[PDB]
Design a protein around this ligand. Structure first.
Ligand SMILES: Nc1ncnc2c1ncn2[C@@H]1O[C@H](COP(=O)(O)OP(=O)(O)O)[C@@H](O)[C@H]1O
Ligand SMILES: Nc1ncnc2c1ncn2[C@@H]1O[C@H](COP(=O)(O)OP(=O)(O)O)[C@@H](O)[C@H]1O
Ligand SMILES: N=C(N)NCC(=O)O
Ligand SMILES: N=C(N)NCC(=O)O
Ligand SMILES: [Mg+2]
Ligand SMILES: [Mg+2]
Lengths: 387, 366
């Protein structure tokens, strides 16, 4: 019984509901100056209904929305999500709040349901861009391990479980896919930094969401990178998410980056299976992760896209919004463009297939590049912007 | 999962918790929740997260979540205390001594000391401390403290300027003038939870002259501050004592109790701030000594803590250092200001020697 108490106090914070001198209203967050997806969808009503309810793992509602409280604004590009899931139970315990987020982000309604997997890279039209415009190509997705708490709340022991488990199965791969794990704890600074500068490694734990949600606890115990000799298939271990599987290469041959991601993902998902550990999956929303942007396919495919004329255009960002494309910096989400170059990728992840989402990138990329071209030639693109 | 599966990997770390945490003491406390729901992992997290320090000092690396934390994990917390304040489980904390008249010296040379400051933190009982407290409690503490503060009369009275309604430009000015606390980027502050919902329930109270001030809901519930330019510690102590008396009374009057233990004096977030929870500092100019191979060693012996011109999370600029009393537990207030003054006295002399092209080996404490 004692462990029950311990487990449900996992947070180690005072629970304002239990002893009764406070109403929910007395704890209601102040989101006056806030601009995220949680402060868009959170209603005093929802809070009153959700604050005193705790998942089997000790996760509380405030545990969830803490990063959106602590982060009203953004010094870079985009509007943040302002909330995380702490376990495999958080979406269900607070479904009426998370359904609304999922809608804003993915355009995926409470009545909606995730489609079957399509990883056929061969069904893909386009994907091979001129290297003048496209500097390199990257496809990544994320996965969680089943019955384990996610990063924001997972304890030390669970994280050491994950690293073992995953860095184990990753050694089952073979051929141009074989490779080696490199734990961050023994990695010296210069190597670490050179891997980040080169785009193969996750940043130092300085990101807002990373620190305020609690994915940077105990750093770097449990944090590591696995890659092949070519370093064109890499896996991250225990940063934002237990696993990120990453295909990438310089140039503009997306199609080849997808053909490999598809080849490596299927192995990894199978080997994980082959060791007895499943991956956190929901019937309605597919695959689950720390952030509600990372659901469904969890796929985000991007290019480094130099747009020297179109970026200066007034309706550039609008075009991105309608074309349903994120816009990040050269070095990532917490970075600004360089040399007029933007990381540009599919925004929605829930409610389309891997191939469908990669076709979106492709199709919108062409329009983005085709307009840069029109502009160069002292011309107009007013009609090539979606209505 | 046992306790041993979750024991922190402190291979690199350098701080008190890493220094005092045994596998044996982790197995015992790890599954022990306080009355308010605060855990042992909650308490030590800041130290696991923080193996090193970019600035001066070996850091603590652990905190109390609430008023029951010290008691719950006492076998581990008594070891951290002893390292810091040189205080034993058998010892007791003396009766307060706020009489600045018994003070010897405490009026240094304008050449050497640009300003003085005396502060202590206070904790409102009945509610959790900044690391574990809800928005509900923090709003509660803020209302209760700013009410009582209306009570101040004379030259001490001032206004309460809430942080949520203060604009970034006033805020930046108060910090650069050393009055207000720094933006929430400190490793202790963030990794210990003290910056959740920031700035909800945060603010600073201060008189007109801005020589007497109060911090509300940064690291500790309350912090009481006296400071001024020049080198008249004895005056700042004079003022400090008055106001802290008035403050405790008013709080006592509103039927609000501060977290106190008959042995360990007053109790706050960090085990560095117990007892008198007092830090008396001078901004010291040391152009000659600072280059000496035994400098830091002298401070250590003198029980002086070293900090930068901007506070804890800064280095010294302009050969000017934030020198202060290291301990707070085990000695009255008067005694610690005497330790501060006596050390600052020595430091100044030594500087003069080195400047006169002279040596200071016999000056270094034995
Ligand atoms: N198309 C691309 N080509 C090369 N590197 C990329 C591309 N897109 C992103 N990256 C790199 O991947 C790293 C991860 O950035 P982030 O936005 O945090 O990605 P993710 O969403 O996969 O976590 C960054 O350093 C970034 O430079
Ligand atoms: N002796 C002093 N004279 C003038 N300003 C001081 C003195 N000591 C500290 N300060 C200022 O007071 C502020 C307190 O910050 P810090 O030292 O981090 O916290 P604490 O007040 O708890 O020690 C800092 O801005 C610092 O510049
Ligand atoms: N989780 C992320 N890294 N990005 C999406 C967001 O911040 O809302
Ligand atoms: N309480 C503090 N702010 N500092 C003391 C320490 O972290 O050791
Ligand atoms: Mg990322
Ligand atoms: Mg401080």
């Amino acid at each position: 019984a004692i462990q029950d108490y311990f487990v449900k106090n996992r947070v180690g914070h005072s629970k304002p509901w239990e002893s009764g001198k406070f109403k929910a209203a007395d704890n209601f967050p102040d989101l006056s100056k806030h601009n995220n997806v949680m402060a868009s969808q959170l209603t005093k009503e929802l809070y009153e209904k959700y604050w005193d309810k705790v998942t089997p793992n000790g996760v509380t509602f405030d545990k969830c929305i803490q990063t959106g409280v602590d982060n009203p604004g953004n010094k870079f590009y985009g509007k943040k999500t302002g909330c995380v899931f702490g376990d495999e139970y958080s979406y269900e315990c607070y479904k009426e709040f998370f359904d609304k987020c999922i809608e804003e982000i993915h355009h995926f309604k409470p009545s909606d349901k995730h489609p079957a997997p399509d990883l056929d890279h061969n069904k893909l039209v386009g994907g091979v861009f001129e290297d003048k415009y496209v500097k390199s190509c990257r496809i990544r997705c994320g996965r969680s391990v089943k019955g384990v708490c996610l990063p924001p709340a997972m304890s030390r022991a669970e994280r050491r479980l994950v690293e073992k488990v995953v860095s184990d199965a990753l050694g089952g791969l073979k051929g141009d896919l074989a490779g080696k794990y490199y734990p961050l704890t023994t990695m010296n600074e210069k190597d670490q930094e050179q891997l980040i500068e080169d785009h193969f490694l996750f940043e130092k734990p300085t990101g807002a969401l990373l620190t305020t949600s609690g994915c940077a606890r105990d750093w770097p115990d449990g944090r590591g990178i696995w890659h092949n000799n070519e370093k064109n298939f890499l896996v991250w271990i225990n940063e934002e998410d237990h696993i990120r599987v990453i295909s990438m290469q310089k140039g503009g041959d997306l199609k080849a980056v997808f053909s490999r991601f598809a080849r490596g993902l299927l192995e990894v998902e199978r080997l994980m299976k082959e060791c007895g550990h499943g991956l956190m999956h929901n019937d309605r929303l597919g695959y689950i992760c720390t952030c509600p942007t990372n659901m469904g396919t969890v796929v985000r495919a991007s290019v480094h896209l130099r747009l020297a004329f179109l970026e200066k255009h007034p309706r550039f960002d609008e075009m991105l919004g309608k074309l349903r494309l994120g816009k990040r910096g050269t070095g990532g989400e917490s970075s600004l463009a360089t040399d007029s170059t933007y990381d540009i990728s599919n925004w929605a992840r829930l409610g389309k297939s891997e191939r469908e989402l990669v076709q979106v990138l492709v199709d919108g990329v062409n329009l983005l590049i085709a307009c840069d071209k029109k502009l160069e030639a002292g011309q107009s693109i007013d009609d090539m912007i979606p209505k």
